[PDB]
């Protein structure tokens, strides 16, 4: 048709897969129809990411869409205080990793002079082949497009940087010679261990906070078996 | 007859009379009606082959999902099933046309009734030519149109053209949004490759001779003169080997004369196809292709067909009247036909004969 | 205009008014000083609606 | 708040018709 989207295939509901209530509203553009790593806050309530307890399960907020492909707003399973289902043991099919915003690797091929990047196709002010991480931020912010500093993050050292963003509607590219840009990408990989994080993302990498949530088999599936986070 | 068309109020001095020789020039109005009947039979057969009546103004295009079995086990259970659906909508337009006949009292005082009947018949012929131009324009003009129906705006489509919903996947074939059924030969003269590539544009979607699809190729004489050269395993123009013979006829597709065939193409030679264009159309078979263009009328029966309406001038010195038709067009089976222009390089161009801005006659 | 492209039609009324028994009624306006004013809602030149 | 009078030839685009979602606005002129 056009897209498949993650769903519980096996979820029992008597074996410590549990009902709770949300502590917060779920973002329908950013968090619905995704595999969310979840904990509980200092009240009885489900939160995306590490609450008071750390990660205790996975949640899929299943939401329909209109015939034009937008999410149905008036749902009863996605606002604060709505009831939701959290799984520790089960299978998720049409599985995909979960990531928030956009992130771009920038790297400079030039060893002298200046280079140029485009934000949503409009060109940035010139930046040195040795600009500071502070001056990629200042360059990228400084165009009359209305995004401003408030929704960019930058980190790196002169040869390369990561431009992170919380929004989906901003795209970085190269436009001048002497610089290359790749958006990061995530897709499920067969025979891999997946890991929930304090953000609520589910990824193949355990950093300093990753809590094992399951392993895939064939890439389109996840066998969920949450090694619950502990103190 | 000629591309000469007189307009304005009919006066005295536009009158036709018996001469001093006794020639009744008003007996001559029927003279060209044999050619009118021949042209009407030609345009009718193309309209009947190319069109169907639209019963509902808007159509869904549906895509539905896919599922598989799994290797079973004892102890374990299967991997579940669900079926996504995506829906797009398209319409047919509807537009308004008119013509006016007007006479001064001095014309009406002296005119023979055969002269006013000659004008009514010239208007009925111009009505046929308008419906024919709009049918051909719906096929040749590769631009996407808009129409308002029931307070919503819709896309109104030609064949595939790089706009709108991409073609659905077939058995193995898959198509991106840039896919187009308006294409070029990439050569100044026609190949056997061009008839074979044109057939692939239908067969790629399963409109194929394996499905029992019948095929019509409509072509100008200038193309059919080159196509008659083609022989199995022999080279033609531009280094192209032919995969078929052209096989001459001693037969009709609908009412049009088939000159012969090349593979599964029934070839019809037709001077209404401009030089340098080929039009391939599929019919029948397992997908049950209907005629490529839908004709939409107004919903009210009092608005349907060609109508004659009493004019604003109804008294001495001057009388007028209106002829009016409203109708419109669009394509449902966007893959069931294709058009190729014979040219060396660049884009497809709609021939100026059938482009939307160019006029009301062909 | 009757068929195409326009159709129109009219409404019409003819009437008028006057007073016979000129003493049989009176109007007072509540005000401190100056002339009687006709209220604009019933002044002759002011329009065709109440 | 204060009244306004529409005046001119009634054309297409001055039509009231059944809405996209099926409300017969022409049942309601006596309202």
Chains that touch A (3 or more CB pairs under 8 A): B
* Residue of chain C nearest B313, judged by CA positions: C1
Chains A and C touch (3+ CB pairs under 8 A): no
What approach was used to elucidate this structure?
Answer: cryo-EM
Chains in contact with B, counting 3 or more C-beta pairs less than 8 Å apart as contact: A, C, D
Nearest CA in chain D to B153: D20
How far is Cα of residue D4 from the mean position of the Cα atoms in its chain? 15
DSSP string, B129-175: HHHHHHHHHHHH----EEEEETTEEEEE--S-BS-SSPPPP-SS---
Triad A172, A175, A180: Cα angle to 5°:
70
Contact B321, B327 (CB under 8 A): no
Reduce the DSSP state of residue A154 to 3 states and report it. strand
Expressed in angstroms, the distance from the first to the final Cα of chain B is: 13
3-state class of B44 per DSSP? Answer: helix
How many CB contacts within 8 angstroms connect chain B with chain D?
8
Give the number of other CB atoms < 10 A from CB of residue A38.
Answer: 26
For residue B311, is it left (φ>0), alpha (ψ between -120 and 50) or beta? beta
Instruction: Decide: residue B347, CB within 10 A, 0-12 exposed, 13-18 middle, 19+ buried.
Output: exposed
Q: How many residues does chain A have?
A: 231
Cα gap A63→A73, rounded to integer Å? 9
Peptide bond into B317 cis (omega under 30): yes
**CA-based Rg of chain B, rounded to a whole angstrom?**
26
Q: Closest Cα of chain D to B361: distance in Å?
A: 28
The span from the CA of A79 to the CA of A52, in Å, is 20
CA-to-CA dists, residue C42 to A189, C16, C49, C50, angstroms = 86, 15, 9, 8
Which of C3, C5, C6, C7 to probe by mutation at the B interface, max B CB count within 10 Å?
C3
Q: Do β-strands A202-203 and A211-215 pair in parallel, antiparallel, or remain unpaired? A: unpaired
CB B143 within 8 A of CB B158: yes
Query: How crowded is residue B285: how many other Cβ atoms within 10 Å of its Cβ?
Result: 18
- CB contact under 8 Å between A2 and B87, yes or no, is no
| Spatial contact of B127 and B39, defined as CB atoms under 8 Å apart | no
Chain C contacts in chain B segment 54-83 (CB below 8 A):
none
Task: Name chain D contacts of B89, Cβ cutoff 8 Å.
Answer: none
Phi, psi at A135, each rounded to 5°: -80, -10
User: Is residue C8 within 8 angstroms of chain B, CB to CB?
Assistant: no
Q: How far is CA B207 from CA A1, B50, B96, B234, in A?
A: 21, 17, 35, 27
């Amino acid at each position: 048709a056009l897209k498949t989207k993650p769903r519980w295939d096996k979820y029992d509901g008597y074996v410590g897969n549990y009902r709770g209530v949300l502590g917060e509203d779920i973002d329908l553009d950013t968090e619905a129809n995704r595999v969310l790593a979840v904990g509980t806050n200092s009240n009885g309530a489900i939160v995306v990411g590490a609450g008071q307890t750390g990660i205790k399960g996975l949640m899929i907020v299943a939401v329909g869409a209109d015939i034009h492909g937008a999410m149905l707003d008036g749902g009863i399973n996605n606002h604060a205080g709505d009831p939701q289902d959290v799984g520790k043991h089960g299978e998720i099919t049409n599985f995909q990793p979960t990531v928030f915003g956009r992130t771009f690797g920038v790297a400079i091929s030039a060893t002298e002079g200046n280079v140029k990047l485009a934000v949503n196709g409009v060109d940035t002010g010139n930046i040195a082949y040795d600009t500071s991480a502070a001056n990629l931020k200042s360059g990228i912010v400084a165009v009359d497009d209305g995004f401003t500093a408030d929704d960019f993050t930058v980190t790196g050292t002169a040869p390369n940087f990561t431009i992170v963003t919380t929004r989906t509607d901003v795209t970085i590219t190269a436009s001048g010679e002497g610089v290359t840009v790749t958006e990061a990408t995530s897709v499920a990989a067969a025979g891999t261990n997946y890991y929930g994080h304090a953000d609520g993302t589910v990824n193949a990498v355990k950093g300093s906070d990753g809590v094992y949530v399951g392993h895939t088999q064939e890439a389109d599936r996840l066998i969920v078996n949450v090694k619950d986070e502990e103190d | 007859t000629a591309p000469v068309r007189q307009e304005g109020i009919m006066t005295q001095g536009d009158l036709v009379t018996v001469t001093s020789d006794g020639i009744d020039l008003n007996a001559l109005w029927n003279s060209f009606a044999e050619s009118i009947a021949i042209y009407n039979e030609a345009m009718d057969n193309l309209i009947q082959l190319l069109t169907y009546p639209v019963t509902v103004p808007v159509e869904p295009v549906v895509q539905i999902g896919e599922t598989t079995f799994e290797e079973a086990t004892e102890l374990g259970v299967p991997r579940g099933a669900g079926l996504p659906i995506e829906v797009f909508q398209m319409g047919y337009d509807l537009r308004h046309y008119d013509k006016r006949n007007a006479y001064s009292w001095m014309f009406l005082a002296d005119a023979d009734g055969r002269q006013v009947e000659a004008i009514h018949d010239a208007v009925l012929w111009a009505d046929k030519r308008l419906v024919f131009r709009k049918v051909m324009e719906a096929l040749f003009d590769n631009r996407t149109r808009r129409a308002n129906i029931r307070n919503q705006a819709y896309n109104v489509y030609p064949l595939y053209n790089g706009d709108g919903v991409p073609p659905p996947r077939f058995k193995n074939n898959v198509f991106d949004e840039t896919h187009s059924h308006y294409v070029i030969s990439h050569n100044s003269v026609v190949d056997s490759s061009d008839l074979e590539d044109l057939m692939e544009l239908l067969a790629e979607h399963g409109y194929s001779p394996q499905a029992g699809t019948q095929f019509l190729l409509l072509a100008n004489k200038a193309e059919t003169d080159a196509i008659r050269q083609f022989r199995r395993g022999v080279v033609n123009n531009n280094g192209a080997t032919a995969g078929y013979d052209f096989i001459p006829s001693p037969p009709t597709f609908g009412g049009l004369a088939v000159i012969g065939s090349y593979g599964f193409w029934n070839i019809v030679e037709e001077d209404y196809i401009p030089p340098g264009y080929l039009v391939g159309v599929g019919y029948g078979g397992a997908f049950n292709l209907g005629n490529p263009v839908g004709l939409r009328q107004h919903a009210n029966p009092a608005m349907q067909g060609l109508r004659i309406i009493a004019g604003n001038y109804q008294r001495y010195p001057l009388v007028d009247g209106f002829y009016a038709r409203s109708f419109g067009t669009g394509v449902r089976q966007r893959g069931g036909a294709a058009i190729m222009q014979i040219k060396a390089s660049g884009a497809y161009e709609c021939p100026p004969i059938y482009k939307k801005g160019g006029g009301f006659l062909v």
